[PDB]
Amino acid sequence: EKGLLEKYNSLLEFFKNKKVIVAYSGGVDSTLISKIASDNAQTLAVTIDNGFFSENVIKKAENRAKKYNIPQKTIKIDYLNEITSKDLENRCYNCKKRIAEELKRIKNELNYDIIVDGTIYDDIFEDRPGIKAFNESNIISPLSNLKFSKNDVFELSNYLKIDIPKKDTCMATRILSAPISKENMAKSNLAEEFIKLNFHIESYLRVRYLENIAIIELTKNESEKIFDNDSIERINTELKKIGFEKVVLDLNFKG
Amino acid sequence: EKGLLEKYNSLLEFFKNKKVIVAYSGGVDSTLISKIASDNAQTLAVTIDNGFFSENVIKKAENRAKKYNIPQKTIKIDYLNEITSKDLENRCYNCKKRIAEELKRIKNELNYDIIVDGTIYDDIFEDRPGIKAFNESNIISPLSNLKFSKNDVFELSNYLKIDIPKKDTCMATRILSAPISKENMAKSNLAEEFIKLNFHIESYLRVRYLENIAIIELTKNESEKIFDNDSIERINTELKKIGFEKVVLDLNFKG
Ligand SMILES: Nc1ncnc2c1ncn2[C@@H]1O[C@H](COP(=O)(O)O)[C@@H](O)[C@H]1O
Ligand SMILES: Nc1ncnc2c1ncn2[C@@H]1O[C@H](COP(=O)(O)O)[C@@H](O)[C@H]1O
Ligand code: SF4
Ligand code: SF4
Ligand SMILES: [Cl-]
Ligand SMILES: [Cl-]
Ligand SMILES: [Cl-]
Ligand SMILES: [Cl-]
Secondary structure: OOOHHHHHHHHHHHHOOOEEEEEOOOOHHHHHHHHHHHHHOEEEEEEEEOOOOOHHHHHHHHHHHHHOOOOEEEEEOOOOOHHHHOOOOOHHHHHHHHHHHHHHHHHHHHOOOEEEEOOOOHHHHOOOHHHHHHOOOOOEOHHHHOOOOHHHHHHHHHHOOOOOOOOOOOOHHHEOOOOOOHHHHHHHHHHHHHHHHHOOOOOOEEEEEEOOEEEEEEEOOOHHHHOOHHHHHHHHHHHHHOOOOEEEEEOOOEO | OOOHHHHHHHHHHHHOOOEEEEEOOOOHHHHHHHHHHHHHOEEEEEEEEOOOOOHHHHHHHHHHHHHOOOOEEEEEOOOOOHHHHOOOOOHHHHHHHHHHHHHHHHHHHHOOOEEEEOOOOHHHHOOOHHHHHHOOOOOEOHHHHOOOOHHHHHHHHHHOOOOOOOOOOOOHHHEOOOOOOHHHHHHHHHHHHHHHHHOOOOOOEEEEEEOOEEEEEEEOOOHHHHOOHHHHHHHHHHHHHOOOOEEEEEOOOEO
């Protein structure tokens, strides 16, 4: 019903005279709200380093903030512990529940007013369990409140000259069996980079960790790129060198 | 050092005037020793039906015996129970330890003299744990004692006009996670027959059961037969219809 300018103006009216903390991740959503908050209010983009994202990813987030003149701080957290390594069922809840607690801490030592996150309108019709953990503590989702779409976000990002980066997705999601270890996520990430580089899988690729078995996930059109037996033999041999017991391919290719 | 005729004659000298029970399975090894025992001695080929081999396999064994005039009896056993469904580490030991006990029972109610099995010379340089369980109780392996090779067995089978059947291998081996259930082995067997029929995988094929995940094992030359995405989509969809949670392909193809 409302258009983008009305939404954009509504967004600026909200940030007026507010001390804003953005849960900044480097993604398109969070960066867009971080930039709009920086230009109209006293804003701090806080990145909580869980150990679930690669160094490249955190550096990318830090640089984007320095590029767009977003005031940004990163907090490396010792999050991986024995209670957290187990309980894989609620990892996302615990993950975001902890991040929320650190943001709330930064907010009250800084004595800022609100904390916002880049949750968009589309995200509300999903099973996002960490939005349970986040929207458990007071956490404002302004893009979601103003009915911003994925296109509304991408579109306003172009006008504001924010480059659309390629999405880096949580490494702990590759871990299908407890515990979420630093080494297990490494085992997948190396496997993913090796496959992606030697066989050029630009589209969706995943190497799941299931009890030291690597499960390769790929897209329907990328498929032929690994169908010859010399490519398969190289992947199985290299992924086992990384220490997977068996290397397998999930035959449910993404449509 | 010794030739086949000397071995063959040595074999006939051993069975002379002996009441022989053969642990008959229908395989090339067991059938050959069953036939030579039948023609020179009062012999009974006993098949112990574990629930680990398909009906086709037992029928094939029964028919081969009736075809070669081998006196044969089959004993269906209630072997699958709660202690036996678990303890997958020693399945083979328990498997053969039980079969041995039934053969020993048949032997002493019949008051026969010896029990023999088709263990060949080549088999002695393998980790065969049920030969531990078998050669735990007195169990004579005459082909092994007389240095019979795989070729010595195949060769003498041709002279004696015993057809070489295609080997049917234990279904419980497809089960990689406790428990070895009747339904789980079914889940693999159906999967195997479906893949083997619709895509013509004549060479080595396996569908392992690992916590309701099907792991497809195939040979290097058969590989291209399932490499197109319409073949993969059909297999993943059908094997999940059988009730596997995920359908995966082991990228360690047999050389
Ligand atoms: N480095 C980070 N700093 C702050 N929040 C993060 C970070 N990485 C991931 N998140 C959180 O991850 C959630 C959504 O991203 P994801 O669930 O990882 O795709 C949001 O609630 C973010 O707060
Ligand atoms: N139906 C059967 N009757 C008697 N022994 C069997 C039967 N099926 C399998 N075996 C045993 O299986 C062992 C070797 O075959 P396998 O280990 O199944 O490849 C031998 O010790 C046989 O006694
Ligand atoms: S995917 Fe889950 S574990 Fe990873 S950052 Fe998001 S909520 Fe945390
Ligand atoms: S493979 Fe193992 S379980 Fe199957 S028949 Fe042989 S010893 Fe028994
Ligand atoms: Cl304060
Ligand atoms: Cl979530
Ligand atoms: Cl008696
Ligand atoms: Cl064995």
